[PDB]
């Protein structure tokens, strides 16, 4: 009865949106940066190497002071490193050894991790006694966790494989708000610098922009072909870059609501695992499944260098706050710190 | 270096000494992955060899420590987390014999014994489990005996072409699950007809694990 006309109205609305999107597209960004001096050549060498994980490494996160580090492996261990001296500060054992995410609080007091048990655990690093202990366990997801980010010392946002994202309240342990609209597993998160919006990439080959305070979707971006594995925000806060399994990375713009450029090659056939930017936004580092890591000119799409030092595939990648170093993790159980 | 960094170095040395000590305690264990489809009898299997997300079980038989991970309560995409389990000693598969006469609930044009075959075909031929053996369990055999007299096996496969007896049907069913393996040069499949049996269920697993370990040791010399 009314289903057919509802479908027709939805199709015409989508056509109208695409028509407006095409009409507002004046010219490509490549023409503008035609007369821009290229970066040249980028050379980086391994300055530090950290060992101690007897298993695959799945995630890492940099501290807010650009000195401390957190890593999580499927051996059931959470290690806090001191990057300057390659020292060990803490070693936390997990109840379940199937962990696939970790995070570091901006204040430096808390650390969170989650995995295949559908539970996010929060640890306290500054107890009165000389040990760490679980402070709160959050439950309510019906699927494995994928990402974890700290808004502040009392708020946290998680994404799981049940096609939902939620905003928690650590003190009470209850979900303040829930986000719906994805038709596939959600695999990544990225908090805006203003800490007012965030983006998520799902397995249905799409990305969405959420509003933390109103709890509603504002924009959705398409253009990928297979699946989205990583996402990251531009330092300006008006753009983001994604990474997929089709072996392509794309840059999207919020204000124009389109796609600007793509980062593809011909000798690359494996999917992207992680994506990160630079302090100024001139470079874009993306880990790959073929044990290598590439550096792309963000405004020209030219490979500036290669970071090849790992035996197995690269799973995690991060850049310090001040932009003085970049750390890489892999399935060969070694963390390497590179510098320029 | 300055009377406050040597303490950091010794603390880190204690930390990684404890890490190394704890690492080798979990290396002398056998890890098994339990799979199946629906109510094929995983609960009965766990009851025969016993002591939301991932469920874990521990049990010891003859000074071998066993760990079994049940992942039947995920309902998510298997592709995104199946590579976490690469490296397990063996995979346990549970099949219900008394399923040829029954079909799915929400779908009528789908035999319940074909979805199990599809799942076995998908699991056996994977890029991560090329060198991992499979232990196959056919659970409900008494009810199969009860229903085989009146109902024929031709409903599932209209090519059985044999007398409706126990042996000629059970052998055919076992064969139907064994040519789905297209990696005969590197994989082995162990089958066991059991139904509310005794310690026979645990002894078979012990023997299969011993055989797998011996063959793995032999393969390191280029001699097998």
């Amino acid at each position, epitope marked *: 009865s009314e289903l057919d006309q509802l479908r027709q109205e939805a199709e015409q609305l989508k056509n109208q949106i695409r028509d407006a999107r095409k009409a507002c597209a004046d010219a490509t960004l490549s023409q503008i940066t035609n007369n821009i001096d290229p970066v040249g050549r980028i050379q980086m060498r391994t300055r530090r190497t950290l060992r101690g994980h007897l298993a695959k490494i799945y995630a890492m996160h940099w501290g807010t002071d650009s000195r401390l580090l957190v890593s999580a492996s499927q051996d059931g261990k959470l290690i806090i490193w001191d990057s300057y001296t390659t020292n060990k500060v803490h070693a936390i054992p997990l109840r379940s050894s199937w962990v696939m995410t970790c995070a570091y609080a901006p204040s430096g007091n808390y650390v969170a991790c989650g995995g295949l048990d559908n539970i996010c655990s929060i640890y306290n690093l500054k107890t*009165r006694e000389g*040990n760490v202990r679980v402070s709160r366990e959050l439950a309510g997801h019906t699927g494995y966790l994928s990402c974890c980010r700290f808004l502040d010392d009392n708020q946290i946002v998680t994404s799981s494989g049940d096609t939902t994202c939620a905003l928690w309240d650590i003190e009470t342990g209850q979900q303040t708000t829930t986000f719906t609209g994805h038709t596939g597993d959600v695999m990544s998160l990225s908090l805006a610098p203003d800490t007012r919006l965030f983006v998520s990439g799902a397995c249905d080959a799409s990305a969405k922009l959420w509003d933390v305070r109103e709890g509603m979707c504002r924009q959705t971006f398409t253009g990928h072909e297979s699946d989205i594995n990583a996402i990251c925000f531009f330092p300006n806060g008006n753009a983001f870059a994604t990474g997929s399994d089709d072996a392509t990375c794309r840059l999207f713009d919020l204000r124009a609501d389109q796609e600007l450029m793509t980062y593809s090659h011909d000798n690359i056939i494996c999917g992207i695992t992680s994506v990160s930017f630079s302090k100024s936004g001139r470079l874009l580092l993306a880990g790959y499944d073929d044990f290598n890591c590439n550096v792309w000119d963000a405004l020209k799409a030219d490979r500036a260098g290669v970071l090849a030092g790992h035996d197995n595939r690269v799973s995690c990648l991060g850049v310090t706050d001040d932009g003085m170093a970049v750390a890489t993790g892999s399935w060969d159980s070694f963390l390497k710190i590179w510098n320029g | 270096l*300055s*009377a406050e*960094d*040597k*303490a950091a170095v010794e603390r880190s040395k204690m930390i990684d000494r404890n890490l190394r000590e704890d690492g080798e305690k979990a290396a002398r264990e056998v890890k098994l992955l339990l799979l199946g489809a629906g109510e094929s009898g995983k609960n009965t299997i766990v009851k025969q060899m016993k002591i939301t997300g991932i469920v874990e079980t521990h049990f010891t038989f003859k000074d071998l420590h066993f760990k079994m991970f049940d992942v039947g309560a995920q309902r998510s995409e298997r592709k995104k987390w199946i590579h976490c389990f690469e490296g397990v000693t063996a995979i346990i598969f549970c099949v219900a014999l008394s399923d040829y006469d029954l079909v799915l609930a929400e779908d009528e044009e789908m035999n319940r014994m074909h979805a199990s075959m599809k799942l076995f075909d998908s699991i056996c031929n994977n890029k991560w489990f090329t060198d991992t053996s499979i232990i196959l369990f056919l659970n409900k055999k008494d009810l199969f005996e009860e229903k085989i007299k009146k109902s024929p096996l031709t409903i599932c496969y209209p090519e059985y072409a044999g007398s409706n007896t126990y042996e000629e049907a059970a052998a055919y069913i076992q064969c139907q699950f064994e040519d789905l393996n297209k990696r005969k040069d590197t994989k082995e499949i162990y089958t066991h007809f059991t139904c509310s049996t005794d310690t026979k269920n645990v002894q078979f697993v012990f023997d299969a694990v011993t055989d797998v370990i011996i063959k793995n040791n032999l393969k390191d010399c280029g001699l097998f």
Partner: single-chain antibody
Amino acid sequence: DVQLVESGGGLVQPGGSRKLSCSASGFAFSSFGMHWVRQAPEKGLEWVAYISSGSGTIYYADTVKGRFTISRDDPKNTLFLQMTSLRSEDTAMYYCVRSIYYYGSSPFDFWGQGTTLTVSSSDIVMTQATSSVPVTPGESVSISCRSSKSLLHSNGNTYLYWFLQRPGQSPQLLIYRMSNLASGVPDRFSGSGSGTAFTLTISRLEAEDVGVYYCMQHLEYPLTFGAGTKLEL
């Protein structure tokens, strides 16, 4: 809920033998190094010995080595100090201090009550400019001290500590590394320094703030304590 219990003491003849005992509870005793600090009557504190976690490092004072030993018991959470070859100059009350060392830790945070011990009858030096300074209520005053050797290291971290002892009470940690405020201390206190001269600044002095202040160094062993400054109204 950190609690400290000590056993042993009393008058004894010179050359006697005994053992000083300590009890710990409410915290992980196996992850903390321990120190022994004594204070003779009408005298300042004096570092005695140090033992690290795992009993891998032991140190003794110049006038203490040879006639003293230290030990710990992890299962019982007990600390020991055997007494032998005693002299008449060892009449002091012995304290127990816990310390943990990693990136960002604050050692010497908790001090024990201590037990009284009495018998029957180079290196960096800490110097305080003034022995006793009068205090005007409701105003702001400062305490300054200097050292013979600079306490600034290559890594950029300096090792200067401030301790306050209330009249008839155990001392507590105020400021560590001359610029960091310990937990549980009000923001009135503020530490400062530059290279070799260090001054402690107080926003306002109250009735509780009266006490005796001490200065410490941790660049190398032994640990030297400056003479306490008597705050008089």
